């Protein structure tokens, strides 16, 4: 998202406004205003790793765009918007991840390599791989009898079509010491 | 649900894997090791698009 | 399948380590364990 000092009505703000955000959703319920629309209206831009060096990115829009003049103890310890010089804003930080990492529930509450591991195992998990599985003549195909979409899900799973073609079942897990088996 | 982006070769689904190369026409200065008759080197990987 | 069509290969200073610039371009968790660790990248 492009951030502009150019905002007559105050300070520096994200070109993309509530208008655009709704304008998109109308085209979403109609299933005119596409992704290219934000690109041609110059509200969003394509930054390579070299161009990335000359810009300043805010993580969150709202959480890194107002000012100041009680707090929830449960939430994680976060940083300020001390930057006047904001050029761009991250669409959503969770987009730093790839297909595999994106199926992990709360990866921000795990030890770094434990995520790396799961970003290998989910590929070795069974499930529906295509609905035409019955008309394909592949050597070896493993299909889960009764797939279940997970209870703990990402906002990102949507785009990945995971809850439509799942990897397993929501099993009733007891963390106990039983027979020592 | 099939996304495509691959080939069917002799009735086999083949995927072309992206290949990470160093960029070309790029000007790059590097320092040479302790036993070297050259202290520094400027390199350019000049190639036609 | 999705992750296979989004896979990157590095043939051949410290390439296995997750560089700062990989931010938002490559996944910081998706990589093979050992002998190709940090050479095989996932977008």
């Amino acid at each position: 998202f492009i951030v502009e000092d150019d905002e007559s009505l105050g300070h520096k703000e994200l070109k993309v406004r509530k208008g655009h955000i709704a304008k998109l959703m109308a085209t979403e319920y109609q299933d005119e205003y596409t992704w290219s629309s934000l690109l041609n209206e110059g509200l969003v831009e394509y930054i390579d790793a070299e161009e990335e060096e000359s810009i300043l990115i805010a993580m969150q829009p709202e959480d890194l765009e107002p000012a100041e003049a009680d707090v929830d103890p449960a939430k994680r310890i976060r940083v300020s918007h001390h930057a006047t010089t904001f050029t761009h804003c991250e669409i959503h930080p969770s987009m730093i991840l790839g297909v595999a990492a994106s199926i992990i529930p709360f990866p921000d509450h795990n030890q770094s390599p434990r995520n790396t591991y799961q970003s290998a195992m989910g590929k070795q998990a069974m499930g529906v791989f295509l609905t035409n599985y019955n008309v394909r003549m592949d050597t070896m195909a493993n299909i889960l009898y009764y797939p279940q979409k997970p209870l703990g899900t990402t906002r990102a799973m949507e785009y990945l079509k995971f809850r439509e073609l799942p990897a397993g079942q929501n099993a009733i897990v007891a963390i106990a010491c039983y027979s020592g088996y | 649900f099939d996304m495509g982006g691959y080939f069917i070769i002799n009735g086999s689904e083949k995927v072309l894997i992206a290949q990470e190369r160093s960029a070309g026409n790029i000007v790059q200065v590097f320092k040479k090791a302790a036993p070297s008759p050259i202290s520094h080197v400027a390199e350019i990987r000049s190639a036609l698009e | 399948t999705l992750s296979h069509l989004r896979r990157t290969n590095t043939p051949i200073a410290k390439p296995r380590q997750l560089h700062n610039t990989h931010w938002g371009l490559v996944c910081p968790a998706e990589t093979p364990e050992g002998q190709a660790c940090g050479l095989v990248k996932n977008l």
Binding site: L14, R17, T27, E28 | - | -
Partner: peptide, 30 residues
């Protein structure tokens, strides 16, 4: 408002609109 600035949850409508138009094999095909 048509000019009110976007929220946190708002970003997901842009992301929705990204893949709606790009896909996931985007790069391979293009």
């Amino acid at each position: 408002d048509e000019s009110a600035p976007i929220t946190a949850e708002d970003s997901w409508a842009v992301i929705s609109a990204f893949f709606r138009e790009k896909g996931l094999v985007s790069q391979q095909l293009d």
